[PDB]
Design a protein around this ligand. Sequence first.
Ligand code: ADP
Ligand code: MG
Lengths: 441, 28
Amino acid sequence: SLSLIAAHSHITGLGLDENLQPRPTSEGMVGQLQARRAAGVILKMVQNGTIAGRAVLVAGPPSTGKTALAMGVSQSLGKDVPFTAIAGSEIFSLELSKTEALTQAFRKSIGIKIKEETELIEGEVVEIQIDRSGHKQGKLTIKTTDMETIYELGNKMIDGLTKEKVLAGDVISIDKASGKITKLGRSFARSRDYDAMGADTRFVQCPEGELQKRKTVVHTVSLHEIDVINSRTQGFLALFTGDTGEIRSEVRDQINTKVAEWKEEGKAEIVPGVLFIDEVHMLDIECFSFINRALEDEFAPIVMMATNRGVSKTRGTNYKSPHGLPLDLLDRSIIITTKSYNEQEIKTILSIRAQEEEVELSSDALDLLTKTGVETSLRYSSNLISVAQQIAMKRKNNTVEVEDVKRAYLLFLDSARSVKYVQENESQYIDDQGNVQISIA
Amino acid sequence: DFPNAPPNLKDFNTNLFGMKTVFHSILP
Ligand SMILES: Nc1ncnc2c1ncn2[C@@H]1O[C@H](COP(=O)(O)OP(=O)(O)O)[C@@H](O)[C@H]1O
Ligand SMILES: [Mg+2]
């Protein structure tokens, strides 16, 4: 995937053993042993696929691995298991209601693996002979790399051939169920015949193997995609534009019934996934009341929620809540907590980040960065690493040292020093009341 | 028919209910 080195680019997954016992450092994660155990238990719950509609809350101080834990869960899940990560503010739209946005998010987190059986004949047509008066009759020859057979054509087949304007050297595919004819391309022997080629023309080889083939193909389509396709007459365009509107409830019920019928017949399989809502405290009370009932569904996915606020005010209400969330939602949610790191864990995290950013830190520089991290913040030192690397490179030195980190510390401030400077010079910065002294003398 | 005349029998049965090659192609 197109990517650059990002904040969570080093997490290959939860470093869990066979017994769901975390390793001290593995797959790019350090510490948080209890939280990683809980995340692994939730991951195995997702993988089993029997339990439906479970809410998980991730709580802890900021910069403590909540989003890191979610990234690890996503990486462990891998592909073929949907994982929709959205922010708290993303659901607010001018087109969709909040309930509709949450419904679409929930349906995106469930995937349907559907099997379609197709029987086809493919080959390069060698000779076509058509006789017409009464109805017409004709014979046709199609060859493969190791087969050749002459077929007799009905009147409708001849009509289809004529309306497709098939000539010799063309590779075509016919569905014996409907008789529809699709022109794959032309043979290589006809390439020399022209100097400029039309937009439609394509040169393809002669297909190998048997002329008539049976094949089954599995497609991964989310529930939301099925709803959008079956809503309008061209919904698959809305799957890209996003102008889907508030899909009818009866459409969703029909799609649920259709998926159940397919699952009974064994041509569709359900692969439940994980819905991750970042910063759930930005949601409203209406959204939470919807989520409470949404989880009580057979098709409902497993919802992961990450919050950092303690006793804060729930949006849309006039009262404070234990995590910024109403008690009813907290009742139906199991909580995974995170713990602040010590010096050694911060040192290991900084070393991992330096390795990911291909920056060769020194021992003294690493110690200084660890001290700054424990004094101020982990993200501050993590961001200082690359700036120090650039300063060192400007000094035509291939390794970073204490002087480069010191210069990076001096140039780029943190939250504490910025607050100190804004408080020392309150008169030159605009305040809540709007007063500011632009003049100096 | 308008002069109170019956139509052709085969045409009647067809209307109640409703050799040489013409195209040959071969790759050289
Ligand atoms: N246990 C850990 N192992 C490895 N990296 C971690 C760990 N905890 C946090 N980090 C790193 O620290 C940075 C802070 O991310 P995070 O803790 O998710 O912020 P927040 O929790 O405030 O959303 C991330 O880039 C993450 O990679
Ligand atoms: Mg986060």
